[PDB]
Assembly symmetry: C3
Homo-oligomer: 453 residues x 3
């Protein structure tokens, strides 16, 4: 299959579950040399046909931690080994459309997670979802760690370099997606963990206006303080510069020095830092804090998993400790951490969104995939049809979820034939409990919110 | 205090000067250009990137890379603050400081006085000069700007690969930042005066001759230094100086373009060691680039704006000779070639006296006249002759804030007028009531001129205009008019140099 | 002499050639582009920054980075000056030299002949060739241009991160500088002829096939070298060559963009050591300069074109430089010569046999000769002739080490074209210069006092230049047939 984009022709391959898969398409200019720590640039056009049949590179991050996460979230039988590089602003496309005719299938752009430190788009295979629910799946990449989030707190390096790629990727879709059978007028963004935090931010950013029409934050929102550095970040910048062997005489000086370091050097700095940097109020992408901003009204689904701090994350005061551990002398602490990190934040968000006047849907995933219940990221295997790349029970669960996510992708409403009714998160605070028994329920984490608030 | 500029908001601080109801708003370190780092080195200044939110402007900016010892020494000798301020060194130095007496909570169009420090185009910093006193006393907005120095601001290849005058272009860029933003600090962009001393006067002189500075200012004051002061203006083929610098720095000199690329990769620290090896200021500069200056200052002799031009009684009395590590006639005179027939001259200034002690002072007067005396007047005359207002002065006074090592017989030494202009008697301690008054007088003159293009006003001895009567002012303990300054010497020097 | 160009004034010098009243004005080292340094490396040429006052261009410009030994050796063997000139090496080399016989104190529209040196797209310099003689004798403006070589002018990744042909783009940029400025030197921008030998002919051939060179010239002369000479045109996936070069230089090959960024940071000295280690890149189908292969382009169809070769192309010069190892053995070497003839291992016997079935050694040299220049040149001349444009064919101070039995060796025609007999036979040169010059003005070599030079039409009439310059027919006809089969 050969599609014709704005920057040139790209050659893909057919895969039958047939679908046309285009791996590694550049949506920006390689952020190398002096382009580092700067907004993404449009991509230079190419003559002839661009062969897009091999996976693009993860983006520079810890190679061990990244390969481990890829291995734990991937919905492919065999995990794929990625290369590391600063040249990583690529996206993958999975289209079920029959390119030999016009097609306006809805579009679902996925934003991977990884604490804004690790991850890759190639981890998630959208062959299943595309084929099953007849939508165009796009997995994008953005800069991570130092490379995509270094900030000085001033005009010499505002920050959010990573969030700007996400926007640039979204804009590449508006201008080119129709050539793959997708309707640029019906675009949905969704991601989990740091990926949900990103979906949440783009919904709050003026720059992302008109680039999408629906959103899905899976286990993660903007209020999840961990990923949003509020206050003076200058001190974090100065430490990073020092650890890397730079002077901190001034901001401008710190950035110039860092632009000369080699990728390998900046990775050793990253390693020394022993993380595991983040979204900041830069003045361009975010003008005020997520809180102040909650003081685009597009359909927004927000969900969490039963046990967020059950195993995956942990593995990789008195009043509170008491409030969760008092009633038993004999997991409750893991529920504490869970509620503070996703539980409470998610609902307070869903409520504000609901209150600003836009459609809102909540869900609580609860199921132990075959590939602790409702652990971090467990919903991922259902959304991406892992059971097709499994007890007959699981196969069905995936089918149900994909249909929900897909329906929403086209109507801004998850409901449809053969699917338990999913109430809208209105005043009745009606949400969905997804699992072996998917039934409606009400007032999710209500009590805790009150407590923590 | 929070002012709103074109590039964003800046936050300053209020400072009250003894005996004044309206405190002053001080904004330290405001960027008027983009940090000339990396590939921006040896290139014109770029506009400054705008910033979101409010920019805290409450700490002194750093100083353009220069010799840290020599710079801190000069800062200590010219500073009008009680305590001298220790500066950091950096290529990121294109900043300016603002001192405004205006009450920002209302409209204000106070005249503006932009100061251009001196330092032989090799050392110096804006933070040395505190404009709290002048601003408060004469009700004007004082601005102290910075520009690139030494290699960083004057390296030239003599061709389009590095014309030069990078430093003089920042001065223009700083002047343009004022036009576009000064009104937000209570200043009238329509009444801007530039003034500086030594290399700073040489700069004021150049800007008055440069087509690029047209409309950026309306008055000028050159304190002890003009464009004709050959020492700072490299005339002729500069290519050889460029090649030496490149070599000393470990670069090939295959071509111009190659020399500049090589130099752009050197680290600031390396270029400073090159500077140090060069041993300048011990016994690079404005060049005719084609953009800032199209022909020599002589050939050019321009904006007919008012100009004051003055010198000090003993320019070579102690400060300069000392710093350069002067060896203290025909022998030295010749050895002084990089700063300034010999027998005729040595004779003309040392003949009438056998006393070799006196004869020594007479040699210092020679160097003085050649470096400032004669040049200044020949300039004032041309300016006068092109049809614009011209005022001359000769400062003569030994400030109390002078150095301990400075012989007491020295009066009107290099830069001595600085303490009067910047109200040193109101920031430092222990000033005879005589000095306090001298400062008051000078500030009122400099300020009056800053608004009318005429120094005169109530309670001030009459300052004649430098017309055909060559009337000038003698500033000191007894400030009275006099005539035909250095007339005789000019004639002499103008002649010996003829052949 | 002071001429006034678009980017500023340039100052030259007058030089008189023995027996001429009008001395010539020589302008050495004029920039036609911006020094391709730093981030400008591996990118198209940029216009040149304008200078103020008067530029002092009276000294030879540097030579594009290349092997200093091999380059100085070639300069010494082709140069038409009494004494050879020592050049400096630099990436800052996008310059041109001008030799004008015109009397600048009046209007003049003399034809223009732009020379493109050879050197396998690896070595060479414009300063090697002195155009004082040709200019003065045939009254034309001679221009010797320079372009990037080796890695610097031909590195390619096969994609939009470094298409390639950086060197061929300078040639175009040089040609465009002539259009905009040549008239200030007494030249008519409407009558421009390009000519070069070896890799220089290959370049002239490419510019004639490139849409970008349209309207920049009106005549062409390829001396011993055309586009079909496969050795200089990398067809197919070049990515592997790029990855090797990056590795040899100490770069990662994670992606194309990454290879180019890495290489842009290497110092000129480093990239030269990489070049040296390689122990030798070339014209590629980039999509900008060349859209399809030279073959495909000649399938589809027009300025006059002269195409010629020399009697013994592989007689001494090339075999020597490459350090050549000199019926059974023939097939051995032939195969080992794959990077120069790209002949299939199976075919070899047929060929080795066809030419060899001491003397046999000369016959092998004729083989290599025919495959490299002979056959290619004619197949070209024919296509050009068949597309409907004028076509002319021809068959044309040596080294002490050069065996005396060698005649019409590689580049031997150079001394005639550039009037070597007037700086360091005398008649031969005169004849050639008049031909090359006539063509430069009419698109026809013929004129008074010159043996008739037939046009390469269906009669395949060509010229045999030498001690006895007479017409002949069907050049290399038989061989073409053989090889084509
Ligand atoms: P999301 C799955 O990206 O959050 C991460 C942060 C690093 C530790 C594990 C969870
Ligand atoms: P002017 C003070 O700028 O020139 C001289 C002053 C004394 C040190 C050397 C430069
Ligand atoms: P042609 C003159 O372009 O190629 C030559 C270069 C020197 C070695 C043999 C081939």
């Amino acid at each position: 299959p050969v599609v014709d984009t704005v920057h040139g022709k790209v050659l893909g391959k057919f895969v039958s579950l047939p679908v046309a898969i285009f791996l590694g398409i550049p949506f920006a200019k390689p952020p190398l040399g002096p382009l580092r720590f700067t907004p993404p640039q449009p991509a230079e056009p190419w003559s002839f046909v661009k062969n897009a049949t091999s996976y693009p590179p993860m983006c520079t991050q810890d190679p061990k931690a990244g390969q481990l996460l890829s291995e734990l979230f991937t919905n492919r039988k065999e995990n794929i080994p990625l290369k590391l590089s600063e040249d990583c602003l690529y996206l993958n496309i999975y289209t079920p459309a029959d390119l030999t005719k016009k097609n306006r299938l809805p579009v679902m752009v996925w934003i991977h997670g990884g604490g804004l430190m690790v991850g890759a788009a190639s981890t998630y295979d959208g062959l299943a979802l595309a084929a099953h629910e007849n939508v165009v799946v796009v997995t994008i990449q953005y800069r991570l760690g130092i490379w995509g989030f270094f900030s000085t707190g001033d005009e010499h390096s505002r920050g959010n370099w990573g969030h700007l790629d996400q926007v640039a990727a979204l804009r590449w879709v508006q201008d080119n997606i129709a050539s793959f059978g997708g309707n640029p007028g019906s675009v949905t963004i969704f991601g989990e963990s740091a990926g949900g935090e990103s979906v949440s931010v783009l919904v709050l950013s003026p720059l992302a206006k008109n680039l999408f029409h629906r959103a899905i934050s899976e286990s993660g929102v903007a209020l999840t303080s961990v990923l949003v550095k509020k206050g003076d970040v200058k001190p974090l910048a100065e430490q990073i510069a020092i650890t890397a062997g730079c002077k901190t005489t001034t901001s401008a000086v710190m950035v110039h020095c860092l632009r000369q370091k080699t990728e390998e050097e900046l990775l050793e700095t990253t390693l020394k830092m022993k993380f595991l940097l983040g979204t900041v109020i830069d003045g361009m992408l975010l003008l005020k804090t997520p809180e102040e901003l909650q003081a685009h009204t597009v359909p927004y689904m927000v969900g969490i998993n039963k046990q967020e701090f059950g195993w995956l994350i942990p593995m990789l005061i008195p009043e509170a400790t008491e409030k969760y551990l008092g009633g038993t002398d004999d997991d409750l602490f893991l529920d504490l951490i869970a509620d503070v990190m996703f539980g409470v934040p998610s609902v307070i968000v869903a409520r504000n969104h609901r209150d600003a006047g836009a459609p809102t849907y909540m869900y609580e995933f609860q199921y132990r995939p075959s590939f602790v219940i409702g652990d971090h990221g467990d919903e991922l295997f259902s959304v991406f049809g892992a059971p097709f790349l499994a007890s007959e029970e699981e196969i069905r669960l995936s089918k149900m979820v994909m249909k929900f996510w897909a329906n929403f992708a086209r109507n801004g409403n998850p409901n449809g034939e053969g699917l338990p009714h999913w109430p809208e998160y209105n005043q009745k605070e009606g949400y969905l409990q997804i699992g072996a028994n998917t039934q409606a329920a009400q007032k999710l984490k209500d009590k805790e919110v009150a407590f923590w608030t």
